[PDB]
């Protein structure tokens, strides 16, 4: 019954809570993931791989938007992610469905309030090819962890 | 009385204002926004950002030790009380840009306040100051036994 939680630690300085997100949550079980939190766009193949760093072992941030949300931590999942965070773009991008087959990793749904606060710690622009809000950015560096709790 | 300070270690510090008890940390991370959180433009305002209002009276004392200027200083922000993270007070203390001088100060007080503080900010880069009220969600278990026994109170 605790709440579902997204915060932020550095190199052992101390844990930040970001957002106890009332969003919609997928469990596998109830779990405790942390890592790099890492941009992949939309989440689809093709956003995974022109990525130009590591997923493997990290957190991914996506927009709703070009697929469904299945699909996008199918993705995430099939590119050894260990958690989905997915928030909500200023821009609706309509969902178009092709081929797809038949969630462990944990999946939580953030306000893009806390998608902000999240990027203001995290470094790198984001392509202008996104047409996405200026506040986006793709890296978490300097050490920095995110700890994803769902209950 | 006055309240009662002490530091762990370079990380955790601690007050003690009446029977209420406040971690403030100083590191780079920021989970407070200008345009989503409330911005403390006079000491009133710190009534919003405290579970109970009372106890606001303990930043308030700490925010003059620190030698935050009412009148000229750009405004604190913190997290309202409506929401349920807790409590978070930032001070933008940051080694760079318009908070560098501001920031001095700040530290400077804490060096008054806290003797063997530990400065982590680092040159050019964002720095800041976090108030968490003890027992709320947002300041965690850093205000159990196994952190307040071993810090011992004084002042
Ligand atoms: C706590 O306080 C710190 C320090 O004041 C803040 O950090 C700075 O925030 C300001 C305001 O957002 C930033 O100012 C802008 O700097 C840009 C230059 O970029 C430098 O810094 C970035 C860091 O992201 C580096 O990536 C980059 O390589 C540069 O080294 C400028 O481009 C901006 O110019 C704007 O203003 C002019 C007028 O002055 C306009 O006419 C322009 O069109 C333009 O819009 C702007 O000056 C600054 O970058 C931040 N510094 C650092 C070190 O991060 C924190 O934001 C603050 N925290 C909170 C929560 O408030
Ligand atoms: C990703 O895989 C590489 C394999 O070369 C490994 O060295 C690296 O540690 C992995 N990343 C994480 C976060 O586990
Ligand atoms: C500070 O103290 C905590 C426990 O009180 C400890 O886990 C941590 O490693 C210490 N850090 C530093 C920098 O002293
Ligand atoms: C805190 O939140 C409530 C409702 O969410 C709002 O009415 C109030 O104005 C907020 N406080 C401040 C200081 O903005």
New binding site residues.
């Given amino acids: 019954s605790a709440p579902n939680s997204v915060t932020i630690t550095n190199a052992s300085g101390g844990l930040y809570l970001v957002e106890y997100p009332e969003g919609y949550v997928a469990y596998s079980k109830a779990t405790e993931v942390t890592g790099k939190l890492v941009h992949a766009n939309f989440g689809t193949k093709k956003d995974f791989e022109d990525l130009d760093y590591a997923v493997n072992g990290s957190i991914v941030i996506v927009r709703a938007g070009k697929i469904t949300i299945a699909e996008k931590v199918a993705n995430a999942q099939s590119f050894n992610a260990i958690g989905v965070l997915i928030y909500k773009d200023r821009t609706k991008y309509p969902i178009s469905r092709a081929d797809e087959p038949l969630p462990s990793i944990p999946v939580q749904t953030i306000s893009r309030e806390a998608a902000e606060k999240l990027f203001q710690n995290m470094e790198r622009d984001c392509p202008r090819s996104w047409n996405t809000d200026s506040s986006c950015k793709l890296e978490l560096l300097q050490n920095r962890n995110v700890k994803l709790t769902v209950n | 009385e006055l309240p009662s300070l002490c530091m762990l270690n370079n990380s955790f510090y601690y007050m003690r204002g009446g029977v209420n008890t406040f971690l403030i940390r100083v590191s780079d991370i920021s989970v407070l926004m200008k345009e989503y959180d409330?911005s403390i433009y006079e000491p009133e305002d710190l009534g919003?950002c405290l579970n109970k209002s009372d106890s606001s009276w303990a930043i308030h004392w700490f925010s003059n030790a620190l030698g935050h200027d009412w009148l000229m200083d750009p405004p604190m922000l913190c997290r309202?009380?409506?929401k349920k993270e807790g409590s978070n007070i930032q001070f933008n203390i940051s080694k760079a840009d318009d908070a560098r001088v501001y920031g001095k100060k700040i530290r400077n007080g804490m060096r008054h306040l806290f003797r063997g503080f530990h400065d982590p900010c680092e040159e050019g880069k964002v720095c800041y100051l976090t108030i968490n009220q003890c027992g709320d969600p947002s300041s965690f278990d850093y205000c159990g036994v196994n952190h307040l026994s071993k810090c011992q109170f004084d002042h």
């Fill in positions: 409330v919003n309202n009380k409506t």
